[PDB]
Design a protein around this ligand. Structure first.
Ligand SMILES: *[C@@H]1O[C@H](CO)[C@@H](O)[C@H](O)[C@H]1NC(C)=O
Ligand SMILES: *[C@@H]1O[C@H](CO)[C@@H](O)[C@H](O)[C@H]1NC(C)=O
Ligand SMILES: *[C@@H]1O[C@H](CO)[C@@H](O)[C@H](O)[C@H]1NC(C)=O
Ligand SMILES: [Cl-]
Ligand SMILES: [Cl-]
Length: 604
């Protein structure tokens, strides 16, 4: 019940599998196959390794004859019962063992395909017991390693595009292809080709580790074949080009050079980790001041909803060296026994949300999102089935990978065949402004299909310019408006009984009730309510032909997402003048004010 390697002489032992009680594989829906390893199965006639379900049909007589075929441990069960094809022709089974380092509940035998012509049953079993070395899905780059491991497909395989709904190519990278429903890909294959017309041909086998280009750097990956070309053994190649973003990106076919297959894969994982331009601070061109989020980075936060507890870090890993769950992860859904990373801290992006005055931190590229059923109803992890708790799609009493849709299958019997996700998990915090939240505390805002999390965090950190500089430069000329910026009260013009209150670079002080805080320019209709015409923090300064212009946005609601605005223009004069009213542009909803001032005049 053992075989060794012709080139290394490594030991393989399948004694741990040699049960008399054996195991069960499925074919069709309610069809079953009972089988033992290196011995006859107690559910079959004496001297038979595997047989058909209800009707004990010998699909092969048991033996210890274990062949090693290219990284794969292969058994053959010969001289089974008569075959429908011709007289005396025996049924035969090919139980083949493919390597897989991870254990897990899907380490079980399966019919991958059935040749009806030659009565050959094709089986595959995925075991750590069949592994010889380690999974080499990384190559060293200078001081830090580059690691393709998260791209490893662990349930099936990547499907390559329909070039010049039917399948075509199949791909996994550092472990071989997983068993696939009605896809007769040969056991142990890494890269597979399915032709409409023709039994699927092996074109790629996981050769060595990824290789590194020391120049304008990309990453390659060689794949081999024992199956021969129609002009010469087929070769296969995946080139990796770095592309940042949410999608980890499937491989696509590029060149076809006939005895050679070349692919291309655009992926975040190949990108160098980039030290952030300006640390834990958000800076936008449009407002030119900035927020310092560092005071939050100071520690992690445990946010929780419906028993789901996330640990969240701002500019620091979600989990220190203690829970040790989400490697690299900046947000982490703690499941005690584990952790799911909802985005790599390194991938962090900070973007100002102009529409909302809010700041959006976003981590990306965590762990794969969970599967749903074929009919699109989400899986529930963990679930109980046959009195055991499962955390992933299983193959038990069924032909294809399936999950439960309740916490307790045994009780509720609801389920569906898994269709797997392709998005890896994202998270984001949206930072909203609140003056008396010194450092706030995030809460859960939205969760979608266990694939994204968004928190709302109200800090003081993302608020505070109520005071601004009036020293700016345009085309090498410096103007100093600090003269007109009153630290005590404001300026007021009365135009047509309507009072206007206006203060440069600063909050209006002792303003009329209705003039909010932050209000840079105000308006009070004779006996009517008052209207904010602009806010100080949205200040814009500039020069237009001899005039110094100052702009304020985000005033009162002006119909159809329009908001009031104020534009004050200043020609240079001798005095420190008073502001006057010019016009109110109806279409833009903008107020134009005149000011002759000594302030609008650069000097040296
Ligand atoms: C490897 O490391 C160097 C130095 O850190 C960096 O410039 C380069 O972009 C990295 N990328 C790869 C995958 O070679
Ligand atoms: C395919 O080619 C390799 C060398 O390139 C050779 O070792 C092998 O025997 C060939 N095919 C088979 C039978 O594996
Ligand atoms: C943000 O605050 C921190 C305190 O941890 C300080 O070290 C950092 O320099 C500040 N960032 C700015 C304003 O650049
Ligand atoms: Cl196993
Ligand atoms: Cl505090």
């Amino acid at each position: 019940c053992q075989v060794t390697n012709p080139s290394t002489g490594h030991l393989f032992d399948l004694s741990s599998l040699s049960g008399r009680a054996g195991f069960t594989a499925a074919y069709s829906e309610k069809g079953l196959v009972y089988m033992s390893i290196c011995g006859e199965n107690e559910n079959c006639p004496p001297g038979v390794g595997a047989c058909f379900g209800q009707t004990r049909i010998s699909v092969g007589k048991a033996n210890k004859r274990l062949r090693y075929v290219d990284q794969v441990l292969q058994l053959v069960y010969k001289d089974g019962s008569p075959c429908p094809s011709k007289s005396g022709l025996s049924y035969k089974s090919v139980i083949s063992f493919v390597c897989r380092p991870e254990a897990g509940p899907t380490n079980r035998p399966m019919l991958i395909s059935l040749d009806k012509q030659t009565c050959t049953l094709f089986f595959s079993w995925h075991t750590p017991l069949a592994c010889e070395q380690a999974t080499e899905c990384s190559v060293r780059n200078g001081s830090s390693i580059v690691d393709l491991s998260p791209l490893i497909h662990r349930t099936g395989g990547y499907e390559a595009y329909d070039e010049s709904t039917n399948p075509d190519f199949y791909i996994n990278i550092c472990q071989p292809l997983n068993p696939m429903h009605a896809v007769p890909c040969p056991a142990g294959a890494a890269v597979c080709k399915v032709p409409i017309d023709g039994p699927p041909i092996d074109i790629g086998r996981v050769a060595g580790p990824p290789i590194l280009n020391p120049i304008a750097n990309e990453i390659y990956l060689n794949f081999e074949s024992s199956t021969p070309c129609l002009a010469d053994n087929y070769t296969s190649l995946i080139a990796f080009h770095c592309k940042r973003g949410v999608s980890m990106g499937t491989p696509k076919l590029l060149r076809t050079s006939e005895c050679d297959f070349v692919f291309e894969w655009e992926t975040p994982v190949v990108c160098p980790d980039e030290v952030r331009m300006d640390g834990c601070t958000l800076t936008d061109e449009q407002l030119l001041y900035s927020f310092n989020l560092s005071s939050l980075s100071t520690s992690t936060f445990k946010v929780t909803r419906d028993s789901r507890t996330y640990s969240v870090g701002v500019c620091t890993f979600a989990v220190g060296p203690e829970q040790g769950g989400c490697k690299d992860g900046g947000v982490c859904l703690l499941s005690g026994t584990k952790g799911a990373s909802f985005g790599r801290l390194q991938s962090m992006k900070l973007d100002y949300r102009h529409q909302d005055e809010a700041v959006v931190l976003s981590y990306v590229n965590g762990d794969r999102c969970p599967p749903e059923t074929d009919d699109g109803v989400p899986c529930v992890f963990p679930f109980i089935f046959n009195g055991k708790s499962y955390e992933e799609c299983i193959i038990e009493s069924r032909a294809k990978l399936w999950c439960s849709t309740t916490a307790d299958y045994d009780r509720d019997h609801e389920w569906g065949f898994c269709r797997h996700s392709n998005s890896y998990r994202t998270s984001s915090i949206i930072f909203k402004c609140d003056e008396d939240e010194d450092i706030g505390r995030p809460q859960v805002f939205s969760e979608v299909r266990g694939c994204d999390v968004t928190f709302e965090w109200k800090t003081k950190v993302v608020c505070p310019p109520k005071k601004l500089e009036c020293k700016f430069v345009q085309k090498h000329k410096t103007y100093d408006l600090r003269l007109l910026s009153s630290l005590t009260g404001s300026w007021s013009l009365v135009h047509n009984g309507v009072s206007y209150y206006i203060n440069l670079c600063q909050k209006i002080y002792k303003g009329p009730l209705g003039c909010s805080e932050r209000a840079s320019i105000c308006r009070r209709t004779t006996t009517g309510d008052v209207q904010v015409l602009g806010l100080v923090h949205t200040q814009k300064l500039g020069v237009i032909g001899d005039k110094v212009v100052v702009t304020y946005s985000k005033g009162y609601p002006c119909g159809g997402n329009k908001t009031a605005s104020s534009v004050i223009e200043l020609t240079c004069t001798k005095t420190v003048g008073r502001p006057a009213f010019k016009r109110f542009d109806i279409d833009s909803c903008t107020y134009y004010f005149s000011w002759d001032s000594r302030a609008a005049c650069a000097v040296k």
